[PDB]
């Protein structure tokens, strides 16, 4: 329940990452897969035979996993398993509140001992994330 | 479309198919093979009777 | 005339495909008696998910009271084979006709199953 990203145990060796979130979209609301991606031996060619996928919300993640304890995941005869992952495809938070788009960034030190602030570089429509479990 | 010969139909007014011409299935593993393909393996079974000819 | 019956929970399936149109082995751990086993079920005859919950029976003949070599009611999976290895948590190889049977638990829990012997396999899901 810390992350968002389940890794798949089995998947078919012939899919590729297109089909399985089809799959999964159609399974599970619509647009609601943020990153899938699909550990190759070779460079661009051998596909291994598990894959991790990161939900946008930590309820689709509690409704995949319990669809995958009912084997209703039924894709190209395999039963997809879901279990817990070690890390994120990438380091984004789930709560879209956290996350903070178009901001004016500044930065400078206290100039002044009454409350006066100096600005020296003032950035623009900076993104901003808030990692609780990162700590930063 | 996938089973080679007219052994199932579409209904309009109910909108779902229906058997029609049961002894033209020639038993091939189309309409199968297309079940399982789509994801629902046991859509339809189809055998044969033993005791009819 | 039951040696050992316990009650038993599919864990996982080795290959896990709904239409392989393979024999798929199971792997179920007792309840109440921590064991483990090895059976390798036909799926498309008699299906098996993972969580679902079976009895298992063992018996050396199926009559009531002798007559070695009527239960079959009863149960829905009956098999026959034979017990080839003992070697071990002691742990028993039965092949029913080629599919392996691996039951792996305690010394105490088995200890009546004699080598090269004629055995059933009864199964019910409940």
């Known amino acids: 329940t810390n992350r968002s990203t389940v890794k798949i145990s089995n998947v078919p060796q012939t899919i590729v990452a297109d089909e399985l979130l089809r799959f999964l979209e159609l399974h599970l609301g619509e647009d609601t897969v943020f990153a899938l991606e699909i550990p190759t031996t070779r460079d661009n060619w051998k596909p291994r035979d598990f894959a991790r996928v990161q939900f946008t919300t930590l309820e689709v993640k509690s409704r995949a996993q319990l669809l995958s304890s009912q084997s209703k995941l039924l894709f190209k005869t395999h039963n997809l398993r879901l279990s817990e992952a070690y890390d994120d495809i990438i380091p984004r938070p789930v709560d879209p509140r956290k996350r903070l788009d178009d901001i004016v960034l500044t930065v400078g030190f206290p100039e002044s001992d009454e409350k006066r602030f100096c600005a020296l570089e003032k950035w623009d429509g900076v993104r901003c994330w808030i990692l609780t479990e990162k700590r930063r | ?53 | 005339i039951i040696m050992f019956e316990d009650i038993f929970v599919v864990d996982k399936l080795d290959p896990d495909g709904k239409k392989f149109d393979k024999v798929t082995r199971v792997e179920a751990r007792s309840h109440n008696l921590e064991m483990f086993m090895h059976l390798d079920v036909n799926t498309e005859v008699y299906p098996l998910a993972v969580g679902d919950k079976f009895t298992l029976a063992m018996a050396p003949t199926l009559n009531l009271d002798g007559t070695p070599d009527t239960l079959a009611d009863k149960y829905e999976y009956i098999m026959h084979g034979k017990l080839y290895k003992i070697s071990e948590k002691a742990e028993l190889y039965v092949s029913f006709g080629g599919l392996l049977m691996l039951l792996q638990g305690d010394p105490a829990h088995i200890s009546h199953f004699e080598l090269d012997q004629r055995l059933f396999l009864l199964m019910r899901k409940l």
């Open chain 2, 1 to 53: 479309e996938s089973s080679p010969t007219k052994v199932f139909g579409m209904d309009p007014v109910t909108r779902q198919v229906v058997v029609v011409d049961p002894e033209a299935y020639t038993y091939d593993e189309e309409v199968i093979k297309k079940a399982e393909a789509m994801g629902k393996p046991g859509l339809i079974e189809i055998s044969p009777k033993d005791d009819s000819f």
